[PDB]
């Protein structure tokens, strides 16, 4: 019992996406499907590969032929995005499909909103100095976060999150510049310069 | 239909995380409860389905934690107690209700059980304010140095709600987690209003409450 | 954080109330072993929960008598009995009185007033106590206590004793007599002390060491020797002496210990023919199935992985994860073909069409139900397969009913022929490629086995591991059980043979059924330990002789007598002094 | 308590048979018995 799915398929709104579960060696008619929004209980889209279980929208559909097992999804909506899993049935225990991360184009690109913060008085006092930049409501989830200690490059101790899915179907990103209190005080401007589709931003707290 | 599970854990390699999955909203006895391993940064991987009337369970070879799915008919709880623990046994384990035939149909699994399995200790945050810069100042809290995930950062113990946009944690230079919760606050509200992030970390029994000040 | 230090000889106490005089007495009792780690602490400018373990130790250096309190138990919510002890203005004040607790239980102290330190009621250590199963009332210095729960008796011991040392436990020896016994009955798993908030204190953990004790004339323990401390101190526990005079003694026996284990079952050769069951092209029908007994074979459950495999592998008797080493006795694979939805009708606590009439397995049944789709193969359709549609009642466990008699629906006799109210019990399934998956015949097997309680014939499939050589291991070869050191050998074993043996009948060799080769065996090591000492009148330096071994398993030398540690070889030769063996005589000189 | 005379006894739960005498052996405040090399109960102390 071996199958595999495409790692992801990034498709566009109103386009149809048929997600591939392609099983190795033996196959049975029964197969199942999923969407999982990150960090959530996987929800079954399809049943016996021939049946969308009740409660699953009409755009989610399923089929299969031989080794091929398909989740046919239609007319993407910007909120729909998730990770799409399949299930081999019988023929000895199963490999769940590795998932399809849905990256939908045509979502709205925006300049990331910078909330940039110095270390708190108790962060400086304790000696752990975190200059905290934040990045909000930017599509797609992308940055290169370049911390500027004064105007110089910071090659180490600057923290970078991998951009994540937010409540708005937007993408939020955190970055902290971690220093000693000494490294914090002696450089005036810690500049958050976030390269987004090739476009950096500027917001800073003067130290 | 509904499954309530065990709490969050940090588990020693070789120890046993016992994940209860308790049946609500349906009948324990009519359904195989499948179990699936979602680790952080991974996909679903089969471990085993339980039978509710039948203690004998197919377990995955693959990763083998000597997983024994014990079907508790008194409390309607399918247990997965995963031994042979490992940093890859850090995972969100979904117990999945499904038919008792070679019909395996599983829709609403457990809510997920976020169980770290690691040598590290359970550690909560060290709370800190964020210092601010028409009339809206940017302040908040950077959560610090905690383990494991997850963490829910509230504000003012329920006295502060709106304006919050919470940014889940950085995987940091220590392999730990610093998240920045930020409420957008007015400048006229500064000095007449208290801003306190209440950052709860359950596995470590840590509550620290602290004021955010300009 | 803990800042450790070295226990020295502290924590020796009278193990009972007996008296003796001038008599070395070896007692085996939980003590604080000599020279160990002691988790240390402070009171500065700090009293966390610790483990209670089997017992504890304690101390403190008080000019000011600031460490006054103790709180033990399981929980510290009061859901246990919550022990307590308090010491007020030299007045001993005890309780078990049980209360709701707090985060920073403490004692208050004030600076230079008429009443010294005040806060003598400070005592927000908890809320309020309720049900009391006992009650009582009453650097320059050193305190020492011992707290151990045994037989519902939480003991105490003590010495309130003067010192001059600031930094650590002084070096010296003073016994600890008991003060109290409380029949409290708790099980303490932890505890916490209670400071006096504006004073070092220690902790050990009692271990089941064996001390040699020396009582004196008056019966006050003057001295002790741990047995297990080190090579010499086992020679004092053997002799019951504090003076160990010159010459070689003998104390212990060291035994090398197994590395992991070795299972061996023959690979390949022949096995339990699960394939001669499962891949049989046509199984028997459901009304009449195939019972094929499986006996005296290494099980084949390995190969069941790579194949079409099953529609489901489902074990109603025991976990398949058990089956691998689980030893069956009477093995029965139940080999038959049924329609699809009827795999739901083969199981315990199940009713339906099949389980009632043409095939039956118990609801306490022990086995594993196996099926997989024959849609690909059996159909052409396939009318070789059939079920019994009607019978007059419900079946018994393991009754194959092949009787073709016509089911009589009505009162009129059928006279062996069909007619009005006469039903042919046996209805075939046409399996046509145009009918769906639920109609598919699934190719069904059920393990039917007894688990234990019959003599050994079939085991689970091979758990036989890989094989390790020249290294002390534990092993089992095909029912041969033993512990030894496996090597390669040259003894040509007989092809039809299995064991080698030896003149005392003890197993001296084997054959590896997976690859036939001749392994010797050999005991672990043995040897005795012989401490070779000049008289303790001279030096506490000892040189151990591990006898009769080769030096690995341990400044090392090697003798004809054995593995000698702690005596430098010397190319001279002198008259014998302490004879060791094979003409090697130690001595103490430079 | 009678001395220099072969008697039987129970002391505080200790029992045995022997000839009690006046002994100079100094016992310990918390120590109940005495003993001797063989574990044979030897010295005791009148509780009352
Ligand atoms: C000592 O108290 C503890 C807790 O009150 C008991 O220890 C538990 O024992 C059970 C088995 O009997 C274990 O499953 C638990 O893990 C133990 N808990 C801990 C914290 O060790 C113990 O029963 C008590 N001692 C005795 C002799 O009864
Ligand atoms: C005592 O503590 C040390 C740490 O310095 C540790 O290495 C040692 O193992 C401990 N003692 C024993 C007997 O293990
Ligand atoms: C000390 O303990 C005794 C015990 O009952 C108590 O009566 C007394 O009030 C306590 N405090 C002082 C200062 O004696
Ligand atoms: C034994 O008792 C006597 C009492 O006269 C005392 O002087 C002596 O010190 C005791 N022995 C020891 C070793 O302390
Ligand atoms: C059945 O045949 C397949 C070949 O298609 C083989 O891989 C499998 O091991 C066989 N099953 C058994 C139980 O021997
Ligand atoms: C053990 O397995 C190997 C290969 O799998 C085979 O060559 C060897 O003959 C087997 N041993 C026996 C006794 O058949
Ligand atoms: C034993 O020690 C004493 C002094 O403690 C010494 O006089 C004597 O010579 C020693 N014994 C031998 C045999 O040397
Ligand atoms: C001791 O062990 C070595 C292996 O390290 C071996 O070569 C040597 O022959 C052994 N000698 C004896 C006497 O056992
Ligand atoms: C003893 O002498 C021989 C040569 O005579 C030498 O090889 C050996 O190392 C010497 N032993 C020691 C312990 O010095
Ligand atoms: C015990 O009581 C008796 C009288 O009842 C008295 O003569 C004796 O002195 C007492 N001894 C002690 C140790 O209390």
Which strand (E) or helix (H) includes residue A185?
helix A181-185
Q: Do chains C and B touch (3 or more CB pairs under 8 A)?
A: yes
Q: Residue A63's domain is classified under what CATH number?
A: 2.60.40.10
- Domain boundaries for CATH 2.60.40.10 within chain B: 2-117, 128-212
Resolution in A: 3.5
C298: left (phi over 0), alpha (psi -120 to 50) or beta: beta
Q: How many whole angstroms from C537 Cα to the centroid of ligand 7?
A: 6
CA pair distance B204, C552, nearest whole angstrom: 45
Q: Which residues are CB-neighbours of C436 under 8 A, at least 6 positions away? A: none
CA pair distance C300, C303, nearest whole angstrom: 6
| Assigned CATH for C3-253 | 2.60.120.960
Out of A104, A132, A161, a domain closes at A104
Same-domain status, A100 and A117: no
CA pair distance A186, A207, nearest whole angstrom: 8
Q: Count of domains in chain A?
A: 2
CB contact under 8 A, A41 and B130: no
Angle (CA) C410-C412-C415 rounded to 5° is 110
Cβ contact C239:C249 at 8 Å: yes
3-state secondary structure of B209: strand
Q: Considering only CA atoms, which of B102, A24, A31, A28 is closest in space to residue C444?
A: B102
Chain B residues with a Cβ under 8 Å from any Cβ in chain C = 51, 53-59, 61, 66-68, 100-103
Q: Give the CA-trace dihedral at D23, D29, D33, D34, to 10 degrees.
A: -50
Q: Which of C437, C438, C441, C444 to mutate to test the interface with A (most CBs of A within 10 A)?
A: C437
Cβ contact B129:B212 at 8 Å: yes
C45 to chain D, closest Cα gap in Å: 40
Cβ contact A44:A92 at 8 Å: no
What is the per-residue DSSP string for C359-410?
A: ----SS--EEEEEEE-TTTT---B-S-EEE---SSPPPTT------PPEE-S
Count CA within 13 A, CB hemisphere, residue C229.
Answer: 21
- CB atoms under 10 Å from CB of D6, counted, come to 9
CB contact under 8 A, C311 and A28: yes
Handedness of CA C453, C457, C462, C466 (dihedral sign): positive
CA pair distance C62, C68, nearest whole angstrom: 10
Render the burial of C222-260: b for 16+ CB within 10 Å, e for the rest: bebbbbebebbbbbbbbeeeeebebebbebbebebebee
Tokens matching residue A150: 């004064």
A59 to chain B, closest Cα gap in Å: 17
Contacts of A31 in chain C (CB under 8 A): none
Q: Considering only CA atoms, which of C409, C390, C385 is closest in space to residue C401?
A: C390
Out of A44, A76, A104, a domain closes at A104
3-state secondary structure of B56: coil
Tokens matching residue A13: 């709104």
Q: Which residues are CB-neighbours of B61 under 8 A, at least 6 positions away? A: A93, C305
B3 to chain C, closest Cα gap in Å: 23
Out of A80, A104, A128, a domain closes at A104
Q: State how far the alpha carbon of A61 is from the alpha carbons of A19, A42, B109, in Å.
A: 10, 16, 21
Pick the CATH number of B2-117 from 3.30.930.10, 3.10.20.30, 2.60.40.10, 1.20.1250.30: 2.60.40.10
Q: State how far the alpha carbon of A135 is from the alpha carbons of A79, A150, A164, A203, C22, in Å.
A: 20, 20, 10, 11, 82
Q: Considering only CA atoms, which of B133, B134, B144, B132 is closest in space to residue B180?
A: B144
- CB atoms under 10 Å from CB of A171, counted, come to 22
Which strand (E) or helix (H) includes residue C100?
strand C99-101
Which strand (E) or helix (H) includes residue A170?
none
Angle (CA) C322-C326-C331 rounded to 5° is 115
**Beta-bridge mates of residue B184:** B138
CA pair distance C53, C72, nearest whole angstrom: 12
Same-domain status, A18 and A94: yes
CB contact under 8 A, C305 and B51: no
Cβ contact C236:C224 at 8 Å: no
Q: Which of C82, C189, C191 to mutate to test the pocket of ligand 1 (most atoms within 8 A of CB)?
A: C189
CA pair distance B198, B206, nearest whole angstrom: 11
Cβ contact A39:A98 at 8 Å: no
The secondary structure of residue C505, as a DSSP letter, is: S
Contacts of C177 in chain D (CB under 8 A): 28-30
Tokens matching residue B4: 């309530």
CA pair distance B143, B201, nearest whole angstrom: 10
Angle (CA) B172-B173-B177 rounded to 5° is 25
Same-domain status, A118 and A199: yes
What is the per-residue DSSP string for C428-484?
A: EPPB-TTS-TTTSEEEEEEEEE--SSS-SS---B--------SEEEEEEETTEEEEE
**Residues in chain C, total:** 590
CA pair distance B53, C365, nearest whole angstrom: 12
Same-domain status, A91 and A118: no
Q: Which long-range contacts (CB under 8 A, 24 or more apart) does A121-129 make?
A: A121/B129, A121/B131, A122/B128, A122/B129, A122/B210, A123/B128, A123/B142, A123/B144, A124/A181, A124/A184, A124/A185, A125/A181, A127/A180, A127/A181, A128/A178, A128/A180, A128/B144, A129/A178, A129/A179, A129/A180, A129/A181, A129/A183, A129/A184
Count CA within 13 A, CB hemisphere, residue C264.
Answer: 22
CA pair distance A178, A158, nearest whole angstrom: 6
> From start to end of chain A, where are the E strands?
2-5, 8-11, 17-24, 31-35, 43-44, 46-47, 51-52, 61-65, 68-73, 86-88, 101-104, 115-117, 128-135, 144-149, 152-153, 164-165, 171-180, 189-195, 203-206
3-state secondary structure of B81: strand
Which strand (E) or helix (H) includes residue C214?
strand C210-214
CA pair distance C553, A12, nearest whole angstrom: 68
CA pair distance C399, C406, nearest whole angstrom: 18
Q: Which of C77, C187, C190 to mutate to test the pocket of ligand 1 (most atoms within 8 A of CB)?
A: C187
Render the burial of C187-212: b for 16+ CB within 10 Å, e for the rest: ebebbbbbbbbebbbbbbbbeebebb
Tokens matching residue A120: 């708190």
Tokens matching residue C199: 């004073």
3-state secondary structure of C236: helix
CA pair distance C343, C341, nearest whole angstrom: 6
Cis peptide before B150 (omega within 30 of 0): yes
- By DSSP bridging, strand A189-195 and strand A144-149 are antiparallel
3-state secondary structure of A44: strand
CA pair distance C478, C266, nearest whole angstrom: 8
> From start to end of chain B, where are the E strands?
2-5, 9-11, 17-24, 31-38, 44-50, 58-59, 68-72, 77-82, 91-99, 114-117, 129-130, 136-142, 152-155, 164-171, 177-186, 195-201, 206-212
Search chain C and give the residue with CA nearest A48. C437
Look-up: residue for tokens 């919510």?
A: C77
Q: Which residues are CB-neighbours of A115 under 8 A, at least 6 positions away? A: A132, A133, A134, A136, B130, B138, B140, B180, B182
**Residues in chain B, total:** 214
CA pair distance A184, A130, nearest whole angstrom: 8
Q: Considering only CA atoms, which of C262, C320, C299, C321 is closest in space to residue C475?
A: C262
Q: State how far the alpha carbon of D35 is from the alpha carbons of C27, C51, D2, in Å.
A: 14, 37, 21
**DSSP-H helix ranges across C131-261:** 231-239
**Considering only CA atoms, which residue is closest to atom 7 of ligand 2?**
C37
How would you class A5 by CB atoms within 10 Å of its CB: exposed for 0-12, middle for 13-18, buried for 19 or more?
buried
The secondary structure of residue A111, as a DSSP letter, is: P
Cβ contact C122:C105 at 8 Å: no
- CB atoms under 10 Å from CB of C80, counted, come to 16
Q: Which of C279, C372, C435, C442 to mutate to test the interface with A (most CBs of A within 10 A)?
A: C372
Q: Do chains D and C touch (3 or more CB pairs under 8 A)?
A: yes
Tokens matching residue A90: 């019988």
Looking at the CA of residue D26, tell me the nearest atom of ligand 4: 2
Query: Does C362 contact B at CB distance below 8 Å?
Result: no
Query: CB-CB: which of A36, A93, A115 is closest to B138?
Result: A115
Question: Which chains form contacts with chain D, at 3 or more CB pairs under 8 Å?
Answer: C
CA pair distance B47, B58, nearest whole angstrom: 8
3-state secondary structure C71-96: EEECCCCCCCCCCEEEEECCEEEEEC
Q: Which residues are CB-neighbours of A79 under 8 A, at least 6 positions away? A: A169
CA pair distance A155, C515, nearest whole angstrom: 59
Q: Which of C87, C91, C118, C138 to mutate to test the pocket of ligand 3 (most atoms within 8 A of CB)?
A: C91
Tokens matching residue C466: 């890989």
Handedness of CA C515, C516, C520, C521 (dihedral sign): positive
Q: Which of C68, C86, C87, C93 to mutate to test the pocket of ligand 3 (most atoms within 8 A of CB)?
A: C93
Query: Does C314 contact B at CB distance below 8 Å?
Result: yes
CATH architecture assigned to B128-212: Sandwich (2.60)
**DSSP-H helix ranges across chain B:** none
Tokens matching residue C31: 């003590």
Direct distance between the N- and C-terminal alpha carbons of chain D, in angstroms, rounded to an integer: 10
Q: Considering only CA atoms, which of B57, B79, B58 is closest in space to residue B6?
A: B79
Q: Which domain holds residue A145?
A: 113-206
Q: Which residues are CB-neighbours of C221 under 8 A, at least 6 positions away? A: C12, C14, C175, C213, C214, C215
Q: Do chains A and B touch (3 or more CB pairs under 8 A)?
A: yes
For residue A64, which phi and psi values (nearest 5 degrees)?
Answer: -170, 155
Q: Which residues are CB-neighbours of B79 under 8 A, at least 6 positions away? A: B18, B19, B20, B21, B68, B69, B70, B71, B72
3-state secondary structure of B118: coil
Question: Which chains form contacts with chain B, at 3 or more CB pairs under 8 Å?
Answer: A, C
Look-up: residue for tokens 């074993």?
A: C493
CB contact under 8 A, B56 and C348: no
Search chain B and give the residue with CA nearest A100. B43
CA pair distance C155, C94, nearest whole angstrom: 13
Tokens matching residue C345: 């009708």
- CB atoms under 10 Å from CB of C132, counted, come to 12
Render the burial of B105-140: b for 16+ CB within 10 Å, e for the rest: bbbbbbbbbbbbbbeeebbbbbbbbbbbbeeeebbb
Q: Which residues are CB-neighbours of C403 under 8 A, at least 6 positions away? A: none
3-state secondary structure of C50: strand
3-state secondary structure C250-319: CCCECCCCCCCCCEECCCCCCCCCCHHHHCCCCCECCCCCEEEEECCCCECCCCCCCCCCCCEEEECCCC
Q: How many whole angstroms from C198 Cα to the centroid of ligand 3?
A: 21
Look-up: residue for tokens 């016509």?
A: C406
Cβ contact C401:C395 at 8 Å: yes
- By DSSP bridging, strand C331-339 and strand C290-294 are antiparallel
Query: CB-CB: which of C315, C319, C343 is closest to B101?
Result: C343
Look-up: residue for tokens 């042919």?
A: C424
Same-domain status, A83 and A8: yes
Cβ contact A81:A8 at 8 Å: no
Method underlying the structure: cryo-EM
Tokens matching residue D35: 């003993």
Query: CB-CB: which of C21, C177, C218 is closest to D30?
Result: C177
Q: Which residues are CB-neighbours of C407 under 8 A, at least 6 positions away? A: C389, C390, C391, C392, C422, C423, C424, C425
Cβ contact C9:C170 at 8 Å: no
The secondary structure of residue C207, as a DSSP letter, is: B
Cβ contact A186:A179 at 8 Å: no
- By DSSP bridging, strand B9-11 and strand B114-117 are parallel
How would you class C52 by CB atoms within 10 Å of its CB: exposed for 0-12, middle for 13-18, buried for 19 or more?
buried
Same-domain status, A89 and A152: no
Cβ(C80) to ligand 1 under 6 A? no
Q: Which residues are CB-neighbours of B161 under 8 A, at least 6 positions away? A: B155
Angle (CA) B19-B23-B26 rounded to 5° is 155
């Amino acid at each position: 019992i071996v199958l595999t799915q495409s790692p992801f398929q990034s498709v566009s709104p109103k386009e149809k996406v048929t997600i591939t579960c392609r099983a190795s060696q033996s196959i049975s008619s029964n197969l199942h499907w999923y969407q999982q929004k990150p960090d959530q209980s996987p929800k079954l889209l399809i049943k016996y590969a021939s049946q969308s279980i009740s409660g699953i929208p009409s755009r989610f559909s399923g089929s299969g032929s031989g080794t091929d097992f398909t989740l046919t999804i239609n007319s993407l909506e910007a909120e729909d995005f998730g990770i799409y899993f399949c299930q081999q049935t019988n023929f000895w225990p199963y490999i769940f499909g590795q998932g399809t991360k849905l990256e939908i184009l045509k979502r709205t690109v925006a300049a990331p909103s910078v909330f940039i913060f110095p270390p708190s008085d108790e962060q400086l006092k304790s000696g752990t100095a975190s200059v905290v930049c934040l990045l909000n409501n930017f599509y797609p989830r992308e940055a290169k976060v370049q911390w500027k200690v004064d105007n110089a490059l910071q090659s180490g101790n600057s923290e970078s999150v991998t951009e994540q899915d937010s409540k708005d179907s937007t993408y939020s990103l955190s970055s902290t510049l971690t220093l000693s209190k000494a490294d914090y005080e002696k450089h005036k401007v810690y500049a958050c310069e976030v390269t987004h589709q090739g476009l950096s931003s500027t917001k800073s707290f003067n130290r | 239909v509904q499954l309530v599970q065990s709490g969050a854990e940090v588990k020693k390699p070789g120890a046993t995380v016992k994940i209860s999955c308790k049946v609500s909203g349906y009948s324990f006895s009519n359904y195989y409860i499948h179990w699936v391993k979602q680790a952080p940064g991974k996909s679903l991987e089969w471990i085993g389905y339980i039978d509710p009337f039948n203690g004998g369970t197919s377990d995955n070879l693959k990763f083998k934690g000597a997983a024994t799915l014990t079907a508790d008919t008194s409390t309607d709880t399918a247990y997965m107690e995963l031994s042979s623990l490992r940093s890859e046994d850090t995972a969100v384990y979904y117990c999945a209700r499904s038919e008792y035939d070679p019909y395996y149909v599983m829709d609403y699994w457990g809510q997920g059980t976020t169980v770290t399995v690691s040598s590290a200790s359970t550690k909560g945050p060290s709370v800190f304010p964020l210092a601010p810069s028409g009339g809206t100042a940017a302040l908040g809290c950077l959560v610090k140095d905690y383990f494991p995930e997850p963490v829910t950062v509230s504000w003012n113990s329920g006295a502060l709600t709106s304006g919050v946009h919470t940014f889940p944690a950085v995987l940091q230079s220590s392999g730990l987690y610093s998240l920045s919760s930020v409420v957008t606050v007015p400048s006229s509200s500064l000095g007449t209003q208290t801003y306190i992030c209440n950052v709860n970390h359950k596995p470590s029994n840590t509550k620290v409450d602290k004021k955010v000040e300009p | 954080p803990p800042a450790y230090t070295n226990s020295f000889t502290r924590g020796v106490y009278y193990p009972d109330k007996v008296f003796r005089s001038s008599v070395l007495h070896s007692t085996q009792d939980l003590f604080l072993p000599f020279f160990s780690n002691v988790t240390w602490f402070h009171a500065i400018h700090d009293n966390p929960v610790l483990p209670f373990n089997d017992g504890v130790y304690f101390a403190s250096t008080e000019k000011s008598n600031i460490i006054r309190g103790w709180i033990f138990g399981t929980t510290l919510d009061s859901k246990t009995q919550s022990l307590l002890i308090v010491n007020n203005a030299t007045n001993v004040v005890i309780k078990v009185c049980e209360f709701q607790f707090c985060n920073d239980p403490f004692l208050g102290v004030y600076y230079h007033k008429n009443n010294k330190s005040w806060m003598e009621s400070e005592f927000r250590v908890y809320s309020s106590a309720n049900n009391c199963t006992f009650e009582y009332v009453s650097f320059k210095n050193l305190r020492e206590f011992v707290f151990k729960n045994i037989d519902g008796y939480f003991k105490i011991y003590s010495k309130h004793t003067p010192i001059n040392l600031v930094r650590d436990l002084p070096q010296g020896f003073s016994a600890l007599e008991p003060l109290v016994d409380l029949p409290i009955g708790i099980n303490i798993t932890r505890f916490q002390t209670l400071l006096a908030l504006h004073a070092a204190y220690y902790v050990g953990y009692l271990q089941p060491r064996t001390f040699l004790l020396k009582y004196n004339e008056n019966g006050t323990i003057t001295d002790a020797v741990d047995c297990a401390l080190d090579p010499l101190s086992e020679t004092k526990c053997t002799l019951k002496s504090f003076t160990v005079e010159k010459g070689i003694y003998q104390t212990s026996n060291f035994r090398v210990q197994p590395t992991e284990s070795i299972v061996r079952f023959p690979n390949i050769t022949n096995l339990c023919p699960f394939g001669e069951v499962f891949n049989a092209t046509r199984f028997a029908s459901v009304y009449a199935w195939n019972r094929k007994r499986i006996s005296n074979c290494v099980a084949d459950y390995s190969v069941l992985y790579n194949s079409a495999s099953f529609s489901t592998f489902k074990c109603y008797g025991v976990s398949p994860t058990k089956l691998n080493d689980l030893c069956f006795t009477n093995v029965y694979a139940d080999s038959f073909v049924i329609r699809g939805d009827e795999v739901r009708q083969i199981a315990p606590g199940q009713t339906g069409k099949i389980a009632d009439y043409n095939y039956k397995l118990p609801d306490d049944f022990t086995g594993c139900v196996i099926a997989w789709n024959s849609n690909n193969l059996d159909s052409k359709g396939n009318y070789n397969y059939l079920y019994r549609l009607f019978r007059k009642s419900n079946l018994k466990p393991f009754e194959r009913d092949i009787s073709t008699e016509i089911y009589q629906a009505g009162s009129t006799p059928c006279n062996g022929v069909e007619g009005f109210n006469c039903y042919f019990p046996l209805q075939s399934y046409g399996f046509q490629p145009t009918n769906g998956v639920g109609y598919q015949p699934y190719r069904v097997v059920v393990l039917s086995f007894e688990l234990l309680h019959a003599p050994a014939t079939v085991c689970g499939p091979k758990k036989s591991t890989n094989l390790v050589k020249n290294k002390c291991v534990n092993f089992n070869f095909n029912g041969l059980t033993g512990t030894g050191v496996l090597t390669e050998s040259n003894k040509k074993f007989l092809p039809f043979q299995q064991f080698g043996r030896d003149i005392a009948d003890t197993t001296d060799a084997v054959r590896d059924p997976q690859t036939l080769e001749i392994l010797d065996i050999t005991p672990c090591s043995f040897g005795g330990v012989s401490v070779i000492t000049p008289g303790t009148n001279t030096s506490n330096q000892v040189a151990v002789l591990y006898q009769d071994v080769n030096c690995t398993e341990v400044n090392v030398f090697q003798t004809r007598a054995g593995c000698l540690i702690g005596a430098e070889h010397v190319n001279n030769s002198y008259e014998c002094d302490i004879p060791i063996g094979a003409g090697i005589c130690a001595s103490y000189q430079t």
